[model samples]
Target: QVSVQPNFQQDKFLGRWFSAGLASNSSFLREKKAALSMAKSVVAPATDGGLNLTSTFLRKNQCETRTMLLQPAGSLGSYSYRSPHFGSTYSVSVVETDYDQYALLYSQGSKGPGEDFRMATLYSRTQTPRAELKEKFTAFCKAQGFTEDTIVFLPQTDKCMTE
Candidate 1:
């Protein structure tokens, strides 16, 4: 059976994670450009083992802001964020995790069959990962039931990183 893991070490996982891909509903896909420009700035671990996530996305030639609360599990964790612009909240329940390289994430709310309710984020210790590392992570995602075709990889422009 599939199990979930904890995102325990913020020092290890917390940073600028370039979106390799995304799986979302039709509405989200239709506005792919907006999603493509999205970037998540993760803060260091707090006293509670939770990290703060500040997401910035482009909308209407400007930038929008969202705040996320992340609780790292020993090997996995749960995350929730709110979009002030839409007055909507988005949350994710990590289905699986390993500090080694990447993690599989499952949307906890507003998901249906054939809808993109799950996603996998392939991370690296550095801003840019090697092609071999990307291949390895892609293979790992396939093992977790996601094909490369189903994933929407985000571009890694200079703006993708933040302090």
Candidate 2:
């Protein structure tokens, strides 16, 4: 069963968040996972009752921000986001959250030579998240077909906090 938040409220979820952990089977990440660092994001409400997600990450010593529009798929916390550049669609879901501390998100997509891309991101209100949240994220990722080595709690970075 695809688990989602029971009573997802967009208002409480809309705010600044830090990328605390990530688990995925993507090929690119497999090759460069060691160099990965934590990122930041901002969630806002969209005009069509969907969501606007703006994420900032450090790339090649420079900070980059990517904005994606999340259209409501079916349920309250389920969303569909299509990559404007790659033309691939990802079904994004809010697995769990408390709206005050941490949130877990799952996204799956099909792309590049029939490979399935499954990813889970753990977001926190603070830059440094608690250990229990990391364990929770790992458990969730394992349930989603991710191995122990594939799951990682990203290192904190001060590079991409501004703007």
Candidate 3:
């Protein structure tokens, strides 16, 4: 029951998306800092009309990359992801997107009846987004129930480009 980008272009959306801004009520992102020098998340189209996502990032010079299959759920921008490593299903809903450079994604659901949670993440093809664009993302996330102070702006690094 969320509004998504009109005329959603899946093919045009596949590529390396950098994590630029993140804010969430989900405990997973709580107490999280803008750590790591480099972060990259690449998306590839799946034969089943979904996305094959690979997120690569560095923490303390240690590189970690995890791949996941995201299957479209009820809406054009909604997705369901499951992995043995995750041990549970992850639901994603699109909050907004420009299709070329920036995307705003929202994830929600919970382990128990009272554990409902939400996450809002902003992605850009480049590590740094324009001031105007950043403001847009900030306003967008705030409207989605993200804490202002909890929102972190991630720095872009060439470390990922070397990979």
Candidate 4:
């Protein structure tokens, strides 16, 4: 089993993560930017002892943002939340992190028999991630039954932090 981190440090994980390039088989990923669009995930600790994840996107010359409150759930590096907009429960497992460099996160949601909407990604603290960690993340994704096209090595951007 691909395991989550034994100890998750929120302080280390709190920041803006940019997805400069990514591959998704699902059409659900389109926030739209002429195929070169970017998505920035900004994470912060909430006042209620939870994590606040805000996803920002640009569409039609306008910036869009959606925020979610996540409370820690399950054992070690796990978070659960009920989406107010989608009305779905998302259980996320945060895996593979040293806090100073790269980290892997996996989130699973339900839809139908063949419609399991699962999303996973490798993130870096810098605009450029380590090559070794990228390879490990690819292996991890492959082990979970994803193809090469299923993973995209998103680039990093300073825009998220700046914005």
What is candidate 1's lDDT per residue for 2-82, written digit by digit as tens? 345543444565655444445543455545634464354444565566777666654556656666666443344665544
Q: lDDT of each structure?
A: 0.52, 0.89, 0.75, 0.68
**lDDT for each residue of candidate 4 in 31-82, tens digit (9 for 90 to 100):** 4323444567788998867789898765556677888888877665788777
TM-score of each: 0.59, 0.94, 0.86, 0.79
Off by over 4 Å in 2: 110-115
Name model 3 segments beyond 4 Å from true: 34-38, 110-115
lDDT of 4 at 88: 77
Lowest-scoring 10 consecutive residues by lDDT in candidate 1? 108-117
On TM-score, the stronger of 1 and 3 is 3
> What lDDT is obtained when candidate 2 is compared to the true structure?
0.89
Worst 10 residues of 2 by lDDT: 108-117
How would the candidate models be sorted by TM-score, starting from the highest?
Answer: 2, 3, 4, 1
Off by over 4 Å in 1: 1-8, 24-27, 30-35, 46-48, 72-116, 124-127, 160-163
Candidate 1 or 2, higher TM-score? 2
- The worst-scoring run of ten residues by lDDT in candidate 3 lies at 109-118
Candidate 3: residue pairs that collide: none
**Residues 1-163, model 2: lDDT tens digits:** 6799989998899989999899898778977888998989999999989999999999887999999999999989999888887778888999999999999999888454323778999999999888898888988988878988888888988788886
Q: Which is better, 2 or 4, measured by lDDT? A: 2
- For each of the candidates, the C-alpha root-mean-square deviation to the true structure, in angstroms, is 4.9, 1.6, 2.4, 3.3
